[PDB]
Amino acid sequence: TTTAARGGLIWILSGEVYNLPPGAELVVKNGDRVETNGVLAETKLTTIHGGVVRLPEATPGKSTREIEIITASVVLDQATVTVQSSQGRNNYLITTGNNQVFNLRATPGTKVQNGQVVAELIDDRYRTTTGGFLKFAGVEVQKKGKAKLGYEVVQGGTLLWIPEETHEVNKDISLL
Amino acid sequence: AFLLPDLIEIQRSSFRWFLEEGLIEELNSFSPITDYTGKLELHFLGHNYKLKEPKYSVEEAKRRDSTYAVQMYVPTRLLNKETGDIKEQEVFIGDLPLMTDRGTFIINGAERVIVNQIVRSPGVYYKSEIDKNGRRTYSASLIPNRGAWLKFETDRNDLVWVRIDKTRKLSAQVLLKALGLSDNEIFDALRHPEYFQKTIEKEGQFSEEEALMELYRKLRPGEPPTVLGGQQLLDSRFFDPKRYDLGRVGRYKLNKKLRLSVPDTVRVLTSGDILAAVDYLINLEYDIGSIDDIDHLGNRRVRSVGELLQNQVRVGLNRLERIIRERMTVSDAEVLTPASLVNPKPLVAAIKEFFGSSQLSQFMDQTNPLAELTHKRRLSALGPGGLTRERAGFAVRDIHPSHYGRICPIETPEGPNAGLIGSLATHARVNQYGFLETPFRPVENGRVRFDQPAAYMTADEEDDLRVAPGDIPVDENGYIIGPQVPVRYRQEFSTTTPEQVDYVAVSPVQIVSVATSMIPFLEHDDANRALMGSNMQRQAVPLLKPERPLVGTGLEAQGARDSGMVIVSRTDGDVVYVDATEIRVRVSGQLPTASGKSTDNGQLTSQKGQEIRYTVSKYQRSNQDTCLNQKPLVRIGERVVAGQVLADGSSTEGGELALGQNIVVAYMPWEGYNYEDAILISERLVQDDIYTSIHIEKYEIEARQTKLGPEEITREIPNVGEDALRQLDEQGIIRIGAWVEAGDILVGKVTPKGESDQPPEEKLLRAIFGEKARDVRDNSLRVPNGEKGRVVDVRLFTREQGDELPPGANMVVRVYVAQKRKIQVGDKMAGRHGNKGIISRILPIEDMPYLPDGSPVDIVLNPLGVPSRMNVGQVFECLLGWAGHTLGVRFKITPFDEMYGEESSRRIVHGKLQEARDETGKDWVYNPDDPGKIMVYDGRTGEAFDRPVTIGVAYMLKLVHLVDDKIHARSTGPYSLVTQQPLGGKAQQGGQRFGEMEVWALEAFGAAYTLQELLTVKSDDMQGRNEALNAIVKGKAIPRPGTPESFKVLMRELQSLGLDIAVHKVETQADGSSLDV
Secondary structure: OOOOOOOOOOOOOOOOOOOOOOOOOOOOOOOOOOOOOOOOOOOOOOOOOOOOOOOOOOOOOOOOOOOOOOOOOOOOOOOOOOOOOOOOOOOOOOOOOOOOOEEEOOOOOOOOOOOOOOEEEOOOOOOOOOOOEOOOOOOEOOOOOOOOOOOOOOEOOOOOOEOOOOOOOOOOOOOO | OOOOOOOOHHHHHHHHHHHHHHOHHHHHHHOOEEOOOOOOEEOOOOOOOOOOOOOOOHHHHHHHHOOOOOOEEEEOOOOOOOOOOOOOOEEEEEOOOOOOOOOOEEEOOEEEEEOEEEEEOOEEEOOOEEOOOOOEEOEEEEEOOEOOOOEEEOOOOOOOOOEOOOOOOOOOOOOOOOOOOOHHHHOOOOOOOOOOOOOOOOOOOOOOOOOOOOOOOOOOOOOOOOHHHHHHHHHHHHHOHHHOEOOHHHHHHHHHHHOOOOOOOOOOOOOHHHHHHHHHHHHHHHHOOOOOOOOOHHHEEEEOHHHHHHHHHHHHHHHHHHHHHHHHHOOOOOOOOOOOOOOOHHHHHHHHHHHHOOOOEEEOOOOOHHHHHHHHOEEEOOOOOOOOOOOOOOOOOOOOOOOOOOEEOOOOOOOOOOOOEEEEOOOOOOOOOOOOOEOOEEEOOOOEOOOOOOOOEOOOHHHOOOEEOOOOOEOOOOOEOOOOEOOEOOOOOOOEOOOOOOEEOOOOOOOOOOOOOOOOOHHHOOHHHHHHHHHHHHOEOOOOOOOOOOEEOOOOHHHHHHHOOOEEOOOEEEOOEOOEOEOEOOOOOOHHHHHOOOOOOOOOOOOOOOOOOOOOOEEEOOOOOOOEEOOOOOOOOOEEEOOOEEEOOOOEOOOOEOOOEEEEEEEOOOOOOOOOOEEOEEOHHHHOOOOEEEEOOOOOEEEEOEOOEOOOEOOOOOOOOOOOOOOOOOOOOOOOOOOOOOOOEEEOEOEEOOOOOOOHHHHHHHHHHOOOOOOEEOOOEEOOOOOOOOEEEEEEEOOOOOOOOOOOEEEEEEEEEOEEEEOOOOEEEOOOOOOOOEEOOOEOHHHOOOOOOOOOOOEEEOOOOOOOOOOOHHHHHHHHHHHHHHOOOOEEOOOOOOOOOOOOHHHHHHHHHHHHHHOOOOOOOOOOOOOOEEOOOOOOOOOOOOOOEEEEEEEEOEEEEEHHHHOOOOOOOOOOOOOOOOOOOOOOOOOOOOOHHHHOOOOOOOOOHHHHHHHOOOOOOHHHHHHHHHHHHHOOOOOOOOOOHHHHHHHHHHHOOOOOOOOOOEOOOOOOEOOOO
16 A cells, blocks of 8 residues: 655545445446436346246345246146155155155255156065065166166066075074 | 333343243254154154242242242153154153242242353454564454354465364365365355465365365374265264354354345354355455454343353253163163153253352342342353453453443452453343343434434444434433534544434433442542442441432432332232231232222232232341341322332332431541541441441251261250350250340250260379269350340251251251341441541540531541542532531432533532522521531530531441451461361451561561461461460460471472482581481
């Protein structure tokens, strides 16, 4: 912070002083008189495409917008609703009209992306009895990273099993 | 004018609050527990303390010496995530002392109050500062409510480090904790992420190493670190609500501070915040924004029971929890009832304790009503959470100019604590956040409309505005008058004009507090002196009938009223039956009790003779042994409305405060007595019973199974006859109401002494008398010495009598003894203006200079006044008094008699006098020439002098610590344990300690034997002691001393610590080296 030009005088001027938000896109420019609250700065801020405008509720505070693309109004109709807190807590089982049942991988009204969890299906079919070897013949799915969980289970008429009992325990050769 | 809101609600409020909710919300926040495996839920409808009710009168609890309390049930809910099944129960969990009339608590029958303290508030702050040159770093800092902190700064790089505690940490990645892409704090800051960019070393190492080694190679070192590690680390430290309270404030500031947008109860933090901070830090590297000053009262917060308690409860829980966590969980699925899986105790401790001790369960002190108030609305800085005396020094004791209006600056102990302990301005009060909203007045066009019910805003001093100091020459009808009205503003005073101003104080005497804003003519004195004043006022014992003073500040009736040492029209009614113990205008049933039937309370005894049977209590001991009582005061058959006042506390009088009395004083230099800091006194003074007070007295004693036996309480004791086996009951107690004296027996008990260790000479002396001696020490209880006074009571305590005693005691006995005391030479006794003085002579009344009308005056202080005390204020009023003394009419007043170019107070008072003449024409009532000076004769012989002396009445006041409270002597007595040097502690035969500086007055003198001996035979050569003693009893001198003890002790220690001390002689021609004991 320097001195004046050799120092003399420093000022104000009158000519009133506006305290002008970033959200104060102004309409009024040097050497314009407009009136007392003349029209003046008006902020045409902007967003873009995206989805629905789900009117950032005009209300939801004092004003408080929440200005959305809402987008994936996914009609998962027949996601039928069998849902409760038995000694759990809630589950739109999403049984669907086809009784598929898409349990709540994402459950309601969270928000997750990138291979996000969604919906969980039941089936007692292709499930095995009590353990066993699966000396199956011929489905296709890869090692795929996920020959594990993460499956694009291609093709199968083909999955045969030797459901077994299984009792595997360290101790001596001591007993039976 | 205004309305004083109740001035203690401060803590009425708090509690209610809590109560009303202040813990539900916590509570059920803590409601949800469940097996170690999510499979067995343990939650409760934490929304009702369902508390059954206090068992005792208060009274009781006093009598029972028990803790008035309540107890407290929680309904719980349907348990388990294995088969969802209730095994529902509720439980109480603990007793809650549900407050008292004085808005305090009693416990253990004693009486306590919880101070409320004052701390800084969560949120965030910045402090920058310089190097030795001008390198002007900054910092930052965070504080949750509870939980660790987060520190930042700029170290001559402009590049930064996320320190955690003081300087625990230091990482260029000040804002790369749990955030990828980096832009979130590289461009989303839209400012200067590390001055635009990056550290030098802005390395961005945080892939699989993210939250790893950061919390390891330079944290918390010494383990194979583990990206988990680091993680599970931090997330603890800032995310389990378990342990990080922001604090509603927490938010509340933040956001405000940084108009963050996170309302959200978001009781714990985010990232966006964090960075938000960090920016701010930056932005001011670039300097756009303000460091923060914590001294600013606003950003500092005070908190009262409500939570002090509360949270302390929370921890109660956790502890509890664990216990349960397992005990509930781990075991099988059946036994586990919602009953035997919870236990109070830990709570019951935590509170039992909290009260039972903190630094905040202070005792009350009821010396006299305003000693209460002012001890409730006291507030404090220390305390756990606070400071210590040491660890905080000075400028943290000063009048941060925000206190204005909020903390009486006049007000403070000293000792070290100056400043650490303030009390509350008069009008202040607090917002639920626990800052002090400050009442004011909205002046429009620089003019208050008055109508406004004040303006309860300005919780912080930064209303920022034209604010007027409530002392304004105000034009009738609004307008201010002088275009030079000052004003504070941004913490500044500033010549202002009447138009462009906003705010006026409600009054010119708000910033002050109790005993300070009451000074008759405050405006006119030194401060500090007025400091002293206040305090003195708090210590004035109360009297048989302390009279309302003469000239008073108006402001007090209230003060009394809210003591809760008086008895107040609860409601309404026109008295009927009122004997001196209660006012059955109450449970009687007529017009009192019956407009105690006009409108008729919710649950209460809505119409009848109602338990508006107020009792009224006579002579109970105080925390200062002072007595209190409330004679009916009201007449019979007449008409009262709520809030009126029925009978009077200790020292209050017309239902208003009355601390001491008012007597006629003169100012002259009475030779010797009064010469300096000494006061004279007529004899009539206490002859009229004025200035005498009560005091009464606890005395307990107790008997106890020696493994020799019991030891007891007999009427009978060996070796008796008068003052022994005389004023004694069948158990050797006393009858109520018995004079006693200084050695007589309170209660007699003996002891299984037996023998098994005796000198043959004792067996002799038997033989000669062959007295088969007895066997029983006989620790009667005797009045010690210097006491008098009837006995009020006794309070036996054994298996049947409450059995309130240590484990193995049998009886406990209290006994209470009271005592008038007149005044008498030797008593601090002072005015309301730091007039600390001591009685010296009392003159029989017929010797004082009396007055022209012969009316003997009766004190006589020293004239020359307002010196270092600068308390000229007190003449002013003497005078005044005297006016209303001759006019015989009280007069209220207020400090700062402004709105008057001249002293104002000055031409009042004259004025009054003036006119006081002629309403009696006594003439000598007022002499413009030599204002209020008078002639005076003097009793002894009968003449005045060249200089007329002023004269006034004046209100004095007598002070607890009384001569007897400090008198002592010791020929010899009990010694120490370890170190045998007399047992000097104040109660009991103590001894004067001669510290180095004291010895620095002895060896500095000439012949210093004394020194020596004083060092020993009257303190240590043990044998030395004795046999001296003897040696005088013999009749000769005393023998040469030896070596004191505490030497020998020191040997020992040292020796006990790898030494080979050879204190030793070098005798013989062969010079002989030895050693010794």
